[PDB]
Design a protein around this motif. Sequence first.
Motif, PDB file in Angstrom:
ATOM      1  N   UNK B  59       0.430  -1.005   0.055  1.00 48.07           N
ATOM      2  CA  UNK B  59      -0.125  -0.195  -0.186  1.00 48.07           C
ATOM      3  C   UNK B  59       0.889   1.000  -0.110  1.00 48.07           C
ATOM      4  N   UNK B  60       1.928   1.401   0.592  1.00 46.65           N
ATOM      5  CA  UNK B  60       3.211   2.462   1.252  1.00 46.65           C
ATOM      6  C   UNK B  60       3.519   2.498  -0.663  1.00 46.65           C
ATOM      7  N   UNK B  61       3.758   1.413  -1.820  1.00 45.98           N
ATOM      8  CA  UNK B  61       4.507   1.604  -2.217  1.00 45.98           C
ATOM      9  C   UNK B  61       3.407   2.216  -3.589  1.00 45.98           C
ATOM     10  N   UNK B  62       2.053   2.493  -3.558  1.00 48.82           N
ATOM     11  CA  UNK B  62       1.124   2.532  -4.661  1.00 48.82           C
ATOM     12  C   UNK B  62       1.378   4.119  -4.056  1.00 48.82           C
ATOM     13  N   UNK B  63       0.942   4.555  -2.555  1.00 45.66           N
ATOM     14  CA  UNK B  63       0.478   5.724  -2.532  1.00 45.66           C
ATOM     15  C   UNK B  63       1.749   6.373  -3.164  1.00 45.66           C
ATOM     16  N   UNK B  64       3.223   5.774  -2.841  1.00 44.52           N
ATOM     17  CA  UNK B  64       4.094   6.904  -4.422  1.00 44.52           C
ATOM     18  C   UNK B  64       3.626   7.278  -5.062  1.00 44.52           C
ATOM     19  N   UNK B 183      10.378   6.631   0.734  1.00 45.56           N
ATOM     20  CA  UNK B 183      10.360   4.954   0.785  1.00 45.56           C
ATOM     21  C   UNK B 183      10.873   4.421   0.130  1.00 45.56           C
ATOM     22  N   UNK B 184      10.241   4.775  -1.172  1.00 45.04           N
ATOM     23  CA  UNK B 184      10.310   4.251  -2.835  1.00 45.04           C
ATOM     24  C   UNK B 184      12.191   4.143  -3.341  1.00 45.04           C
ATOM     25  N   UNK B 185      12.677   5.340  -2.336  1.00 44.37           N
ATOM     26  CA  UNK B 185      13.581   5.361  -3.445  1.00 44.37           C
ATOM     27  C   UNK B 185      15.115   4.220  -2.308  1.00 44.37           C
ATOM     28  N   UNK B 186      14.418   3.961  -0.888  1.00 38.88           N
ATOM     29  CA  UNK B 186      15.337   3.179  -0.336  1.00 38.88           C
ATOM     30  C   UNK B 186      14.921   1.857  -0.806  1.00 38.88           C
ATOM     31  N   UNK B 187      15.530   0.657  -1.046  1.00 35.74           N
ATOM     32  CA  UNK B 187      15.576  -0.639  -2.233  1.00 35.74           C
ATOM     33  C   UNK B 187      15.127  -1.208  -1.022  1.00 35.74           C
ATOM     34  N   UNK B 189      14.287  -4.698   1.827  1.00 41.54           N
ATOM     35  CA  UNK B 189      14.535  -4.673   2.229  1.00 41.54           C
ATOM     36  C   UNK B 189      14.396  -6.817   2.246  1.00 41.54           C
ATOM     37  N   UNK B 190      15.349  -7.426   2.630  1.00 45.17           N
ATOM     38  CA  UNK B 190      15.580  -8.572   3.168  1.00 45.17           C
ATOM     39  C   UNK B 190      14.654  -9.065   4.121  1.00 45.17           C
ATOM     40  N   UNK B 191      14.529  -8.285   5.342  1.00 46.84           N
ATOM     41  CA  UNK B 191      13.243  -8.042   6.670  1.00 46.84           C
ATOM     42  C   UNK B 191      12.403  -7.814   6.314  1.00 46.84           C
ATOM     43  N   UNK B 192      12.200  -6.562   4.956  1.00 46.17           N
ATOM     44  CA  UNK B 192      10.372  -6.779   5.100  1.00 46.17           C
ATOM     45  C   UNK B 192      10.434  -7.895   4.097  1.00 46.17           C
ATOM     46  N   UNK B 193      11.113  -9.372   3.309  1.00 38.74           N
ATOM     47  CA  UNK B 193      10.854  -9.719   2.586  1.00 38.74           C
ATOM     48  C   UNK B 193      10.196 -11.085   2.760  1.00 38.74           C
ATOM     49  N   UNK B 194      11.039 -10.931   4.522  1.00 35.54           N
ATOM     50  CA  UNK B 194      11.090 -12.129   4.617  1.00 35.54           C
ATOM     51  C   UNK B 194       9.608 -12.152   5.714  1.00 35.54           C
ATOM     52  N   UNK B 195       9.018 -10.742   6.468  1.00 32.87           N
ATOM     53  CA  UNK B 195       8.077 -11.189   7.954  1.00 32.87           C
ATOM     54  C   UNK B 195       7.148 -10.834   6.619  1.00 32.87           C
ATOM     55  N   UNK B 196       6.953  -9.577   5.714  1.00 39.22           N
ATOM     56  CA  UNK B 196       5.824  -9.321   4.535  1.00 39.22           C
ATOM     57  C   UNK B 196       5.390  -8.576   5.595  1.00 39.22           C
ATOM     58  N   UNK B 197       6.064  -7.571   5.974  1.00 38.05           N
ATOM     59  CA  UNK B 197       5.670  -6.048   6.479  1.00 38.05           C
ATOM     60  C   UNK B 197       6.190  -4.997   6.033  1.00 38.05           C
ATOM     61  N   UNK B 198       5.684  -4.326   5.271  1.00 35.63           N
ATOM     62  CA  UNK B 198       6.517  -2.910   4.325  1.00 35.63           C
ATOM     63  C   UNK B 198       6.830  -2.160   5.320  1.00 35.63           C
ATOM     64  N   UNK B 202      11.193   0.813   6.670  1.00 31.12           N
ATOM     65  CA  UNK B 202      11.984   2.166   7.349  1.00 31.12           C
ATOM     66  C   UNK B 202      12.908   1.854   8.744  1.00 31.12           C
ATOM     67  N   UNK B 203      12.346   0.801   9.259  1.00 30.39           N
ATOM     68  CA  UNK B 203      12.880   1.095  10.957  1.00 30.39           C
ATOM     69  C   UNK B 203      14.124  -0.221  10.059  1.00 30.39           C
ATOM     70  N   UNK B 204      14.868  -0.700   8.589  1.00 30.35           N
ATOM     71  CA  UNK B 204      16.131  -1.223   8.894  1.00 30.35           C
ATOM     72  C   UNK B 204      16.906   0.340   8.454  1.00 30.35           C
ATOM     73  N   UNK B 205      16.383   0.859   7.680  1.00 33.46           N
ATOM     74  CA  UNK B 205      16.989   2.545   7.154  1.00 33.46           C
ATOM     75  C   UNK B 205      16.747   3.119   8.413  1.00 33.46           C
ATOM     76  N   UNK B 206      16.848   2.891   9.670  1.00 35.80           N
ATOM     77  CA  UNK B 206      17.120   3.756  10.601  1.00 35.80           C
ATOM     78  C   UNK B 206      16.563   5.071  11.256  1.00 35.80           C
ATOM     79  N   UNK B 207      14.981   4.758  10.676  1.00 31.42           N
ATOM     80  CA  UNK B 207      14.375   5.751  10.931  1.00 31.42           C
ATOM     81  C   UNK B 207      13.422   5.228  11.805  1.00 31.42           C
ATOM     82  N   UNK B 208      13.492   5.969  12.679  1.00 29.31           N
ATOM     83  CA  UNK B 208      11.876   6.312  13.954  1.00 29.31           C
ATOM     84  C   UNK B 208      10.266   5.314  13.731  1.00 29.31           C
TER      85      UNK B 208
END
Lengths: 254, 238
Positions: B59-64, B183-187, B189-198, B202-208
């Motif tokens: 959904x976040x990607x679609x909002x982009x 968000x869509x500028x960041x590649x 992540x393995x993290x979101x790909x595994x958990x399936x949580x968009x 954001x967390x993996x890129x050091x954002x709060x």
Amino acid sequence: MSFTVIIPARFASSRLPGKPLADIKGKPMIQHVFEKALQSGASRVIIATDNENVADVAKSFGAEVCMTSVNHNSGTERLAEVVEKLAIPDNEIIVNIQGDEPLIPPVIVRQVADNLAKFNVNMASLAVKIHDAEELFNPNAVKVLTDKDGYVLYFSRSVIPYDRDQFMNLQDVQKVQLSDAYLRHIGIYAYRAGFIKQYVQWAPTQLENLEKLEQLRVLYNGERIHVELAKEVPAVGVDTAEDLEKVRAILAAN
Amino acid sequence: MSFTVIIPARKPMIQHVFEKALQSGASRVIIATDNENVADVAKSFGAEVCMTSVNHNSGTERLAEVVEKLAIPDNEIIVNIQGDEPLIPPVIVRQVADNLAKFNVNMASLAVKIHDAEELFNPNAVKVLTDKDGYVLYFSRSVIPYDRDQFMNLQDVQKVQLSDAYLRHIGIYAYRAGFIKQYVQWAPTQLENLEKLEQLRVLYNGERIHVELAKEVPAVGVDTAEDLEKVRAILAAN
Ligand SMILES: O=C(O)[C@@]1(O)C[C@@H](O)[C@@H](O)[C@@H]([C@H](O)CO)O1
Ligand SMILES: O=C(O)[C@]1(O)C[C@@H](O)[C@@H](O)[C@@H]([C@H](O)CO)O1
């Protein structure tokens, strides 16, 4: 750079009775951690314990020992007392090598102490990769995940990250092939005497008591932690009699 | 305060979500979809529709793409209400929008307390936990936090005492259009790909990420007298 190592060696332990004195090829476990710390390059090595028997053995092998209260719930709390008792300066870097990490290579001790400045944190720790699913699912194996820069997101005994497509409808646990995304946390911490003092000034948390992870008090209070991947573990943490056989095996294989 | 709601979709829950976005105080409400039928149904109850590509894994990607097509200012606050949340009142929707500045974060979200133990082990219920201020530590389909003593060989989910230590993440985010573009500028992540949580990108890129604990309230503002007469009207013609 310069630093001093403090090894917390609580005697009591549900899982392993007399844990710190557990025998490993003729020497109690704590002695291995000790002799290891000596070659780390530390300026001082102190075995912090709460048992008279452990103190004698530690003295018998030439280790300086500081007696601490049996009322502490973790090594960090115990080291808070050692730091105060021995009036160690707040700026002094302390590397806590938990008494149950008998195979930690000396080079990484120095690395963690240096990681405070390099990554700008008040606390730093280490981790090794997890390759087998059995270890990942073992509650005794503490998992950790960081952001792109190494700063810890969370530490947990739970299976994280969750591999949804492989785990949700997992038919056979033996046909599990983990992806390169898991880290087992090594029981080793670097923090200035002053940060340890701050740690015990913070209030005990429900989070740390649920997971049984002292480091969660740090994350809970908005403090950043850096964890770095080390290469060539080979063994981490001894909490059960089995982990004990794990260490003996990794050594028998000279 | 002043935000626009964008709903990634793909009586209907679609409408029930629209009316909640409206009673939330939003200045503008957009229904983002990659389906002509859905876009067609959204124009039924007078909803602004923005056709987007089917090539969006979240959904976040679609909002982009929406933020691009509508040329929405970067500082404009967008609230993503993924889908329906019947136990979530509209007043909370504005708070999550205001939390961006309050807690000084680029992404803000919410969560509810878990009351049923089965939820903790339901991989489809996303668990979350924060620090003392509400800043997320991690999101996961796995149970977190892990209760060592209780989970050590638990042979019955019914014995699990929650101690109010557990939260279920609700799919609603607040973030400025500019951050969405980031968000869509960041590649991916393995993290979101595994958990399936968009949100893990954001967390993996050091954002709060800030999360607010919300109280579940009975269905508030589900239907209006008019909506119900229409429903009865259909039924009566039988
Ligand atoms: O072995 C330990 O005593 C312990 O489990 C204590 C915990 O608080 C935590 O420090 C843990 C480390 O995460 C290593 O597993 O070690
Ligand atoms: O899988 C979900 O639950 C989904 O709809 C998309 C995920 O990326 C994530 O946003 C999730 C929320 O955490 C709510 O569960 O919603």
